[PDB]
Design a protein around this nucleic acid. Sequence first.
DNA 1: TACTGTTACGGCTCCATCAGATGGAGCCGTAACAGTA
DNA 2: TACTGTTACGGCTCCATCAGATGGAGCCGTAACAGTA
Lengths: 635, 635
Amino acid sequence: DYIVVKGAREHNLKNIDVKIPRDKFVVITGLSGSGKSSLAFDTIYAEGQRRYVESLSSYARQFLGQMEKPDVDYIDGLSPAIAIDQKTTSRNPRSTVGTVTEIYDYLRLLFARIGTPVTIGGKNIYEVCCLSIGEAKEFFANLNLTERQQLIARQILKEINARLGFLVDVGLDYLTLARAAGTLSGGEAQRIRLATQIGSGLMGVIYILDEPSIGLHQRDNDRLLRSLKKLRDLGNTLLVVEHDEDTMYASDYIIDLGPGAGSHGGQIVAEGTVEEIKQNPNSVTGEYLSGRKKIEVPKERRKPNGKWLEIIGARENNLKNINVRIPLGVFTCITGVSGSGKSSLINEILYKRLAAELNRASVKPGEHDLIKGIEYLDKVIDIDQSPIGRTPRSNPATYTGVFDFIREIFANTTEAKTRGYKAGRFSFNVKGGRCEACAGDGINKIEMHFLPDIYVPCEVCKGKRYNRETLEVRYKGKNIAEVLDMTVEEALEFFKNIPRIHKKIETLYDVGLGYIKLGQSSTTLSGGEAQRVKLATELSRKSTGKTMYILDEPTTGLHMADVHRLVGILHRLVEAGNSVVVIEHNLDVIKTADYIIDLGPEGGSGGGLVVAEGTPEEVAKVENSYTGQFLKKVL
Amino acid sequence: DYIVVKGAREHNLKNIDVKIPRDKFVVITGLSGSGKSSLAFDTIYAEGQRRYVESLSSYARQFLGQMEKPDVDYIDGLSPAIAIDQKTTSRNPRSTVGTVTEIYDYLRLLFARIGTPVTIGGKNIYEVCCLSIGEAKEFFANLNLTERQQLIARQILKEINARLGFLVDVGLDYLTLARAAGTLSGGEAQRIRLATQIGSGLMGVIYILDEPSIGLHQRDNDRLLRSLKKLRDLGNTLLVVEHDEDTMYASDYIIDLGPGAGSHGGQIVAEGTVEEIKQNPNSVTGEYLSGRKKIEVPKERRKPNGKWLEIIGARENNLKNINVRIPLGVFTCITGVSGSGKSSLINEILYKRLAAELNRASVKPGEHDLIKGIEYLDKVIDIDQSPIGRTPRSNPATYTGVFDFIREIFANTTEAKTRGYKAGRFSFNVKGGRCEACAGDGINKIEMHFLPDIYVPCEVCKGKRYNRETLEVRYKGKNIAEVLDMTVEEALEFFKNIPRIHKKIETLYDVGLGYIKLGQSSTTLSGGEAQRVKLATELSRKSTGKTMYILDEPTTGLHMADVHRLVGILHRLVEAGNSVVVIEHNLDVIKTADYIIDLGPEGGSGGGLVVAEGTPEEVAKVENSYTGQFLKKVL
DNA sequence: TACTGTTACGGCTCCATCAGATGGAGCCGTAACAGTA
DNA sequence: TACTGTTACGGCTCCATCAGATGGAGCCGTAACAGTA
Ligand SMILES: Nc1ncnc2c1ncn2[C@@H]1O[C@H](COP(=O)(O)OP(=O)(O)NP(=O)(O)O)[C@@H](O)[C@H]1O
Ligand SMILES: Nc1ncnc2c1ncn2[C@@H]1O[C@H](COP(=O)(O)OP(=O)(O)NP(=O)(O)O)[C@@H](O)[C@H]1O
Ligand SMILES: Nc1ncnc2c1ncn2[C@@H]1O[C@H](COP(=O)(O)OP(=O)(O)NP(=O)(O)O)[C@@H](O)[C@H]1O
Ligand SMILES: Nc1ncnc2c1ncn2[C@@H]1O[C@H](COP(=O)(O)OP(=O)(O)NP(=O)(O)O)[C@@H](O)[C@H]1O
Ligand SMILES: [Mg+2]
Ligand SMILES: [Mg+2]
Ligand SMILES: [Zn+2]
Ligand SMILES: [Zn+2]
């Protein structure tokens, strides 16, 4: 009736002991970097998978793969578990919806077993693969096959029906089975990934979902919550790590981590129901949910100064030749149901034309007639909706670009000048100044065949990634290993008189990563930490006073405090005289915008029109828009 | 704390509900054919494996394979399970001890990871593979490697040490790692199979062992029981299906099935401790253990009549050029520790020479000088230690040889003579008289890719395996489908006036298979049922009054009642004037023998000498023999 | 002449056993070119 | 002359993703040959 964990010390967990109720809807909350993933996916799921795998033969074990042994003492009440990872999965161009959701395999099995020589219900394999999800489901629900075929193909038909029912329930009935998985939107790809693993329900199985609401509108999130509630009612346990308020409100139990991030978190601050979390002063999530701490809606919203960006004849993808006016110099939020065509408009027309017109880029934009009002802009800065790549040869210092300046100033010292060194000597990714016994890695990763990998630190350089010859040159009493060793606050104090480094380090501090180390590997970063690193990298660039910031969903992996900090940064940028355009599903970011352009009313072929246009108060007066309904509810 | 099963109806289970204690030594007893395997390996293990597999992806599922869904309602308290099947596994000549026990893989991993360029402890891969188990274990326990190598290769060394420790504990220290697995004795192969799956212990794992004591002496069984007790004390649950008295006496809980076999069993008769089972009148196992029912030791043992079989210079395999005298006309039991060389003597010299001398066979015997006393014999009948092959095209009627006579008498009828039919028309394995829609199978087995197979009965012949044209000819009002449909008692009454069929059917009844059907598939037979079918096939042959019966472990898969029946049959054969020689580890069979030849004192290179020779009472006076010690204990 | 052993020969079925590679995409470091200030 | 965009190019690393085959052994059915009784 419980999953009891004792002595969990993985990553930054501070020897925490927790009890998780079984056959319930449990939600794990906390700040970005608290340790929710290290507790759910890296301890419980890892222990369950290892326990299941250890009972199999070596031949099967070397195919399935063994996870790393978690640093835990005793876990009880486990069971078979299915986990959905937080990180998004890229797709090859060949993979389609049917291939990804494992529907084509069942289709081939059915056609091979009860096929009529290649005719089940009066259709062939291509005629049934090239249909929308809703009509394919209604076709498969009206299959008049014989009794022998019914007995033979019971399981295949049941699996197909369950998968199609889930895909219809989430709201993806407009897609077909032949649509390429690599061209779907963020929310559609997230829902397809969810349906791949959770479409066919089981019994007595723990489901661990790490942020299952990427690029999902509130309406889509409600349908996903209904499906999750049905799956839990099927006799299962659900462990969902989320930052969404609706997910917490729709859960039986809440486990709150914190109280901070990195080395200041890894603990348990509060637990109980939603009201219990709200009443706990030590819980930051409860403080933000109870209204004690909140993002303040402006009393007066900025008005356009007469300069507008007019997009005429926008017909890219599913856009139905619409005209959109984006005011300049204010904060504008682009809203719509997942798949309605907000990314395909903004990121594929506005940014792709602004870059060519201003930054002298060579990227072909989408299908549009013309854009007017470009002359009121100087440069464009964009943040994509795609995640960042993770390599052990990467860290926040290299990603943001300050490591180049640090290496240059290290190579400009007196001793380095005497020895004839350059900036390439002070990097652990170039031969000449790095330890060759570890190739600048610092630690050695030994990979076994079927056993979990073992990490052993290097002994020649003691994990410093550099040899003594390169470590013999120091700047202000510190060598480059100590430079990579200090955190962002220490580096901010260290380089306070160097504007070039100080600007980017101050940006990193302002996005909320002062605790992080300059040399922490990208592979060991968190989702929110990587998102904020990308945000700081893009926002650390120089602003000319009349510049456009285009952000495509910068809320992913961010707690309420993090989005509050980002909102403050964006509002300061707006007050500086720049124009900020944000494609956002987060309603807290939306409620502070001075202008809203809403698209819909549906996704795919059912959307692409400007349902609403104006200030949030005016949009809330429109009953057609779901965004308007939610805005009216929360205003 | 329990494994609760409800509504189990697999095979012949009569909707039984049981509760199995956890972290205990549980033994399941009952008659041959009661349903112990169908309850342990076909319900609990099947459900656990299916539940674990269903949580994985299709790619891994179609590699691991899905077991058939058991006919059960609700099973709780499950966990990862490791099962050892009752049926023995044949081995290719290429496989060795290290390959089978998964020790070579760990050896290669260690040599690749901490090798010194190919030198770990001062030895190479061949110099360490070509050693006995004890010296290899003592070498690996004295490895003076460096600290970095110690940290790197901790798990590999731990696994190797645990496997070698188990192999030494069971008593196989005289074997090597390069020894071919296909040339081992029955007990040695059984112990190697056990060590493959149970050598490295785990925690919180259910172990299901189906008859883990094939070809094991009492001394070897004691060591195996000690190892099993240690493994259970490591925090595990053990479910052992056994007929051995020592295994029941060394278990915390006993679950008894019955009260019979086939359609007369499948229930639960009693449960509790050993004393509780003994005190239950409805429990046949308790009745045999408590002494109410027993095999009666003869008051006076038959003496040799002056005719002996002298084997001079027996040096085959591990035999040390020994001389053995086997009295003729009495019951002689060959006893010894597993590997001492009883099979290599008897089956490889005595039978292989008697067959050539009497049955005009062309099989080359082993290494011996000569055998004297052959002229007092007319024919030899042998039962091998190997199990029988299982095919769906097989049944007891075809195996024993009565189906040929039945087909001949069916083809000799008036209507068959008029139509010009032959015996080949009345068989479901020859084209012409069988249904071609199922190829004489009766049912169709549809195999999926990763889903469990589905069985659908044929519709053209309704599962009768024959068409209407072949079913239109009947003998005594019954067609051949009804002939295959009746049980052995019905066929015994049916063919009471036909001596040829009646002899074999009476033999089948006498071995205890009167309930079984003539047409039951061999693949669906039980281990004890197959053993008794082979015994009846070999014992149904004509006896000339002076003939030698050689039986190599005919007790496998047989309860105490079955071995009592077999002992009675063998004693009747002896009283008929024939000579019976039985290689037996069962002490109840041994105590009734009129002569005993004991070999030992150890296995492999440590045995091959006649430790004792004489009547069981005289052998019990020798302290050298473990067999003598047990005989003294039980006499 | 029939019962009882052996052998071969064709067809059918069960079981052991082995121990990832290739294409796609992102990131670091370096160089080159161009527009402003 | 310096700060800030773009592009290319080499090297390194992470991730998706596909959808068993072959040799060995036992058994049924049939035929042929031989030793007795
Ligand atoms: N190897 C490591 N050693 C120590 N700390 C680590 C290591 N890897 C990650 N961390 C830190 O451990 C903290 C928790 O990581 P993680 O559990 O992934 O965060 P999270 O709670 O899921 N955050 P988010 O996904 O953004 O909501 C973060 O501050 C990481 O930077
Ligand atoms: N390359 C493409 N070819 C065809 N259709 C596409 C392509 N890319 C996207 N679409 C479709 O265009 C519609 C709008 O997608 P897009 O504009 O990217 O989504 P969005 O509204 O921003 N929603 P989301 O990203 O989930 O928050 C969806 O139905 C997509 O499936
Ligand atoms: N498909 C089937 N349908 C009905 N009965 C079956 C089937 N398969 C096997 N049986 C019978 O079910 C009974 C129990 O089988 P099984 O569980 O294998 O026996 P067991 O208890 O392990 N006996 P043994 O191994 O000799 O000690 C036997 O009489 C089988 O002949
Ligand atoms: N072909 C072979 N070549 C070499 N050694 C062999 C061979 N067959 C058996 N041995 C060994 O000879 C010894 C005696 O084996 P064997 O006589 O078959 O055993 P047994 O005494 O009858 N015991 P068991 O069959 O387990 O009850 C063992 O050490 C075997 O490993
Ligand atoms: Mg996370
Ligand atoms: Mg059995
Ligand atoms: Zn090093
Ligand atoms: Zn048929």
